Amino acid sequence: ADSDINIKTGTTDIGSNTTVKTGDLVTYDKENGMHKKVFYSFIDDKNHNKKLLVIRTKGTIAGQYRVYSEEGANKSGLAWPSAFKVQLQLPDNEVAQISDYYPRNSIDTKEYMSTLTYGFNSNVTGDDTGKIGGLIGANVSIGHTLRYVQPDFKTILESPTDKKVGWKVIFNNMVNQNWGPYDRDSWNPVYGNQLFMKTRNGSMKAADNFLDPNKASSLLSSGFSPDFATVITMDRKASKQQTNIDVIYERVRDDYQLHWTSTNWKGTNTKDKWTDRSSERYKIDWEKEEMTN
Amino acid sequence: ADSDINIKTGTTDIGSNTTVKTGDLVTYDKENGMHKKVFYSFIDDKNHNKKLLVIRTKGTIAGQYRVYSEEGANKSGLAWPSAFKVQLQLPDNEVAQISDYYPRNSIDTKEYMSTLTYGFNSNVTGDDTGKIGGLIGANVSIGHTLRYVQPDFKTILESPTDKKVGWKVIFNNMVNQNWGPYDRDSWNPVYGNQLFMKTRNGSMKAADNFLDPNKASSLLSSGFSPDFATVITMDRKASKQQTNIDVIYERVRDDYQLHWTSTNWKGTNTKDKWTDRSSERYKIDWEKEEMTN
Amino acid sequence: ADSDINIKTGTTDIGSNTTVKTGDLVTYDKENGMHKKVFYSFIDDKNHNKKLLVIRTKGTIAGQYRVYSEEGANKSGLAWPSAFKVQLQLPDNEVAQISDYYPRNSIDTKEYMSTLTYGFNSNVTGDDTGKIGGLIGANVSIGHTLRYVQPDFKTILESPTDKKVGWKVIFNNMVNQNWGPYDRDSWNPVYGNQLFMKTRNGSMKAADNFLDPNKASSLLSSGFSPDFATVITMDRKASKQQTNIDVIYERVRDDYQLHWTSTNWKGTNTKDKWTDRSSERYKIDWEKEEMTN
Amino acid sequence: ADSDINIKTGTTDIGSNTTVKTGDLVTYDKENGMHKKVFYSFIDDKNHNKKLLVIRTKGTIAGQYRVYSEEGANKSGLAWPSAFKVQLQLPDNEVAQISDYYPRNSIDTKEYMSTLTYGFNSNVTGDDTGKIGGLIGANVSIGHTLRYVQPDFKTILESPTDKKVGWKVIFNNMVNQNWGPYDRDSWNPVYGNQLFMKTRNGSMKAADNFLDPNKASSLLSSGFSPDFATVITMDRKASKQQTNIDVIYERVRDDYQLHWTSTNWKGTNTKDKWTDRSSERYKIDWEKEEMTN
C-alpha cells in the first residue's frame, strides 16, 4: 500500500473531486434463465491520462439442477451445472483497452505438520505360583500432516488480453451426506461416481435416488451470482468516442446418469454435456458518458 | 473493491449529495401469525441513469412449533416449521425491474486433512527361569479428516428474474440432546426419525415425549426474522410512474408423528404437510416517492 | 449492507440532520427487587413517513438464588431464577405500532468432523531356543465429531406482533464443579438432579450442601441486565397523539430440593414454582416528544 | 445497535453539542493501603430530560498478601485478599437516582464436543513350526469433551438499586506451580488445601513454605485496579440541587495456615478472616456542576 512507501493513503488513487456518472442495465434471458445486470460508472478525472469506465457484471445465473430423463424405474439422468462463465469482449477494431479486472487469481496455501515421537516402556508381571516375568521396550514414530481448505466452487480469472477478459466458477468437489468429497472424476469399481447418489442400494425409481438439492451446494440449484469488475480505458484525443462491448453469460451442464445394476446403483458423469450461452451487446458513448443496450 | 483497481473508496457508489425518502409499513397477519414490515427508501441520484427504490423485508414469521394431535397416550403429532419464505413479485406489465438483491448464495468451503504415520517398536522380555524373548515390529497408518460447519437453517436466494425475487430459510439438521445431527430424512430401523424424540423408551403420554422447544432451535418456536433487501429500478422517462408490488410471507410446516410400538417409541416425519401464506400488495408512486398498502 | 448493493453506507438510514429528544425513566421495585430503566429517544425525521420512538429496556432483574426452606438437617429447598422476561405491550385501541426490535433470533451453527483411518502392522518375534514367530495385521477406523457452543443462558425474542414484543433469557445448562453440564431435566437414578448439589455424600446439613453462588453463574445470584430495544412508529396525521405502553419485568423461579437418603444426597427440581412480576405503565406524548410514568 | 434498526450510528446517544465539566478527586488511605480516585463528568444535554453525572471509580486496592504469623518453624499463617469491593450509595432522602452502571454481568459460554468412533481389525500369525493363527475384532468408543475459560478473579455486578450499586472482584481459582487449579474449598485428605503451599514435604520453616508472590496472580500482592462507571440522573426542576454520595472500597482477606504434620505439610483456609473498609463522602452540586470531598 501507500503507507508502506511513506505515502499518505489514497494519494495515488483515481477519483478525487471528480463527477462520476453511474447507471444500471437489467436484462432477463428467460430461455437460458439468466438475470444479467451491468452496473457501469464513467470516471473522467482531469489528473488521469484517459477516461475510465468501470463495468460490474452482476446478476444470477440459475443452476438448473434437475432430473431430465426417466427411462423407467431402472435408469435416470440429471443435468447439473459444472461451470458458470462471464466474459467481456471488445471488437478488434476498437481503440478502447481493458486495463484492470477483479477478482484475480490468488496463491493458495497449505499447512504442513511433522511429528517425531519416541518412547520407552517397562513391565514386570507375576502370578501366585511364584513365576516372575519382565519386559522392556522402545518405540519411535514419524508422522506427516497436510491441511488445506477446499471450496465447493473455485473462481478463476482466465488469461485476459487488452480486448477480452473472463471469469469461470467451476465445480471443485462436494460432500454427499458426510461422505466424500466427490468430484467429476470420482470412480468406484462397484458404484461408479457417487457425486449425487442418494442411496447405494435403495429400492426405488432411479429418479428418486438423486441427492436432494437442499442437501447439496446452493449454487447447483438456485444458481451463482457474479460480482466481477472490469476497467476500460479510453484515450481522450481519440477520433471515435463510441465503443461496442459484448457481455457473455455461460452455463456448462454435466449429465449424471444413475442406473440399477444387479444388486446396487451405479453412477456415471459425462462432462460438458450442454452449454447455455447468453450474449448481449452494449454501446458506450464516452462523450455523453452513457451506456445502452 | 475500488481500492483493488486503484480507485478511491466509494467513488462508484450511488447516493452522493442526494435526498433519500424513507418510510415504514407495518402489518400483522394474526391468522398466520406473521409480523410483516417493509422499510423502503427512494433514491433519486442525478448522476444515476434511473430512480432506485430499496425495499427491505423484515419482521418475524412465527415458528408455531406445537403438538396438534393426541390419539390417547400412544400416538401424537407435532407441527413444526421446516421452511420460511419471502417473495417479492412485480406484475408482468410493469416497466420497473428488479436490479439487485441481498443476501445471495455463497460458496461453502471445507477443510481437508491427510496424515501419514509410520513407526517401529522393539521389546525384549525375560523371566527368572532364564527364558529370554524378543520382538521387533513396524506399523504404518494413513488417515483422512474432513471438517465443515453445518448451520441449523440455511438461507438460500432462489433464482431471481427481473420481475420476481425470493429467499427461503430451510431446516438443515439439528442436534437432539447431544445426539445426531438429525434431519428430515433421518431413519433408524428401530426408532424411525428421532428429530424431536425426547426419550427412546419412556413410559409417558405421546404428547409428553416431544423435545422441549427451549432445547431446540429458537427458530422452530419463536420464529425467524427476515432481513432481506431488494432494489427496483424505474426509468425516468417512463410514461406511467406508478407500480404495484406483491410481498409474500410463507411458512411450510412438516408433521412429526410419535407412536408407541411394542417396546419403544417410533417417530415419522411427513414433509410439507401445511403451508401458511400471507400476501400483501403495495403501491409505489415514483413522483411523490411514496409507498402505500 | 448498502455497500453490497452499490449504495454508499448509511444512505438509507434514519436520523440525518434531525433533532432527537432523549430521556431516562428509573424505577425500583423493592418487593420484586427489580431495577427498571427505560431510555427513550424521539426521532422526527422529515424524510421519514412517520415519527419514531426508540425505547431501550435496561436495568437489572435480581437473581435471588437463595436457600428458603430448612426442614432439619435432612431436607432443604433453594429458589433459583430459571427465566427472566421483558415485555412491551400496547393497548389494542392504540394506532401506534411496534415496527422493529433487537436482538432477534439467530441461527446457531455446529462443526462436523469425519475421520477415516486405515493402518497396517507387522512384527516378528523369537526366543533364545530358536523359536521364530510372525504376525501381520490391518485395521480400519471411522469417527465422527460434533462441536458446538452452549451458553449458560439463552436470549430468545418471543414471536412479536404490532402491539406486543418480548424477550426471555432462559437457563440452558450449567457446569457443577467441572461436572455436567446439568440442566433442569437432568436425572440420575441415584442422585436425581445434581444441578446445585455441592457434595454427593457429604455429612452436613442439607442447607449447607448447595453450590456456592460464587461458583455458579453470576446471573443466578446477582441477576441479569436487560439490553433490549424496540421501535414504535406513529403516523403524523393521526388525530390522537398520545399513547400508553406497558413494560413488564418478569422472573420465573424454580425450586431445587435436596433430601438425604439412606446413604447419599438426592436432588429434585420443580419448574416454574414462583413468578415475580413487575408492571409499569408509561404515557408517550408525540407532540411534546416526552415520556412519563 | 442503531444500525440494526435502520438508524444512523450515534443518533440516540447523549452528548451532542454539549459542554462537559470533568474533574478528578484523589485520596490515599494509608492504613488500608487504598489509592482511591474518582473521575466525574457533568453532562447537561438540552435534549435530555435530566442532568447526568458520570462517576468513574478507579485507583488501586492493594492486595497485601503477606505472612503475618510465625509460631516457630512448624506453623505459620498468611493473609491474602479473596475479594475486592467497590460500592456507591445515595442517602434514602436524595432525589437523585442511579440509572446506569458498567460493567454488568455477562453470560458465560462453554464448548461441547461429542465423538463416536468404530473400527475393525484383523491379523494372522504364524511360526516356523507351521502353526497358523488368526484373529478378527471390532471396537466402538464414545467420548464427550467440555471446554471453558476460567479466570483467576471474577468481576460481578451486585444487584443494584436506584440508590446503591456495587462491584466485587472475587477469587475463583489459581494454578500452583502447574498444578491445580486450587480454590478456597480445595481439600486433600493428606495435604489439606494446597492453594499457596510451596513444597509438599520440604524441610524448612513454615514461613518459608508459602508460594512466591511473583509466581502467583499479581492481584494477590500488588492489588486490583477498579475501572467501574456509574451514571446518576438528577431532575432539572428539583428544588434541592445538592447531593451526597458515599464511595466505599473494601478488601476481604482470608487466612491460609500451613502446619507441619508428622511427615508432610498441611494447609487450611479460613474465609473472610478480615475486612478492610475505606469509606468517603462526596458532595455534588448540580448547579455549579462540581464535586468535592
Added chain:
Amino acid sequence: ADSDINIKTGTTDIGSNTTVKTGDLVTYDKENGMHKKVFYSFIDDKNHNKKLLVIRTKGTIAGQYRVYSEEGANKSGLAWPSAFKVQLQLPDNEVAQISDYYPRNSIDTKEYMSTLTYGFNSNVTGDDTGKIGGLIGANVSIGHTLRYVQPDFKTILESPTDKKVGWKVIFNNMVNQNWGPYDRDSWNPVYGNQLFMKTRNGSMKAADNFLDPNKASSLLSSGFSPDFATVITMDRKASKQQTNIDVIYERVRDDYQLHWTSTNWKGTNTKDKWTDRSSERYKIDWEKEEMTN
C-alpha cells in the same frame, strides 16, 4: 509507526496538499501472451526534497500449462510455468534513482511443540481354575512437532540496486490429488517425479495422463497477476528532466515428461527449459509529469 514514537499518524508521510498526476499504459504481447499494465503516479511535494514517480506493474502473465509433445501413446511432454518475473531497469547514465519497492522479503515463522508424557498401568487377571496373575508397568514418551505454512508459489524481491529492481514468483510445491506435496526435485525410484501425473498405472495415452489444470493451482494455467510497486526519485535541480525505463515481464517454463515403463508411468522434470521475455521501454518526462511508451 508514528504512534510508537509519540508522533501523530501520517505526520511524516508524503503527499499533503499536493496535486498528483496519474496515468495508465496498457500493452498486450500476443506471442508471449502477456497483458502488461503500468499505473504511474507523479508526486511533486514542495516539502519533499525531490520529485517522486510511483510505478505499479500490473496485468497478467499467462500460465500456458499445456501438453506440447505427443510421441504416440507411450510418451508425452507438458510445458508448465515454474517462475514469473517482473523487472524494472534504469540506464546506467540516468540520474534518477530507485528509492523504494513493495512487496519486500518477509521473515517466515514456524510453530514448535514439545511433549513429555509418563504413565503407570497395572492389571490383575485370573481364570476359573484359580490361577491369579498380576502385571504392573510404566511408560515414558517424548514428542516434537513442527508446523508451518507452505504456499504453492512464493514471491521474492530480488536484490535491488539504485538502477534495477525485480520480483520473482516461483513454484514452491503442489498437492496432487491429496498426495504430496510434490516439488521440482521430488524423486521416487519407481514413479520418478509425480508432480502432474494423473494415474500411476493407468491404461491410456500419455497425453491423457496429465493432471487436470482445474485440479492444479490456478497460476499454472490461467496465470499470475503482478501487484508490484516501485518509487523513482528525481532531483529537481537536475539538468536533464527526461528518463528512460525498461519494464520486463518473464515466464520460465519447465518441461515435464511422462513415459510408460513396463508396468507403470514414470515422470521426469527438466528445469528452465524455456524462457519467454517481453520487454518494453518507457519515457518519463518530469516536467510535463507524463509517461509514454
Added chain:
Amino acid sequence: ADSDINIKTGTTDIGSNTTVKTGDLVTYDKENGMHKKVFYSFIDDKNHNKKLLVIRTKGTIAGQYRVYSEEGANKSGLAWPSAFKVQLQLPDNEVAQISDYYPRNSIDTKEYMSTLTYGFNSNVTGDDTGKIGGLIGANVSIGHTLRYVQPDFKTILESPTDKKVGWKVIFNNMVNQNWGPYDRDSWNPVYGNQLFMKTRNGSMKAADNFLDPNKASSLLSSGFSPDFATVITMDRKASKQQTNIDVIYERVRDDYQLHWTSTNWKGTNTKDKWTDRSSERYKIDWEKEEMTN
C-alpha cells in the same frame, strides 16, 4: 465505554479545544548503562478541575547478561538481569498528586478441558487346529487438561500511592534449547539449576558452557524498554506552582554459577546478587508548563 451507557464516544474525555505543551528529556547513565527518556505533556483543560501532567517513562535499561567470573576451567559465574524497575516519587510536602497510571494489573485466565470416554471391544480368534477363542471387554477414561500462556517476563504495577508509583518487569521462566521451562527456583538433584546451562556434560571451560545470549530472551542481553505512563494532578489555586519529582531506573542482577562435578556440570542461582540504581530529579513549573532536570 461511553457507548455502553448511551453516551457518545469521547464525550467524557479530557483534552478538548486545549493547547498541550509537550517536551522531551534524555539522559544516559553510562556506568549503569541506562538510557533514560521522559516525555512530558502539560494539559490545561478549562473544563477540568485541575492541571494535568502526563509523564511517560521510556528508554532502555540494558540487560548486561555476561560472564563475570572465571576460576579456571572448572567453575564460572554469569550475571543476568532478573528484574527491571521504574519508579516515580513525589516528596511528601508536595501538593501535587499521582492520579492515574498505565499499564495496570490484568486478570490472567486459563482454559480448562474435561473429557470422558467409554468404549467396548470384542474379538474372536482361531487357528488351523480348530481352537476357537473369544474376548469381550470395556474401558472408561477420564481426562483433565489445563492450558495457559506463560510470558518470559511479567510486567507488574506495584501498589501505588498518591505520592509514589512503580512498575517491575520480572523474570518468570525461560525455555533452554526446547527444554524446561526453567525458573529461578528450578532444581534437579543431579544438575541443579539448568537455566543457562549449555551442555549437561560437555568437556570445555565453564565460561564456554553458558547459554548463547542470542538463543535466550532478548531482554536478558540487549535490555528492556519501559513504556510507562503516569498522570499528576495539580490544583489551580495552589500557592506554590513548583513541583519536584524523582524518577528511578533499577536493574536487579542474579548470579548463576556453573561448576564441574565429578561427571557433569551443576548450576546454582543466587537471587538479587546486585542492584544497579539510577536516580534523577526533575523540576516541574506548572505556571509556564515546563519540565527540566
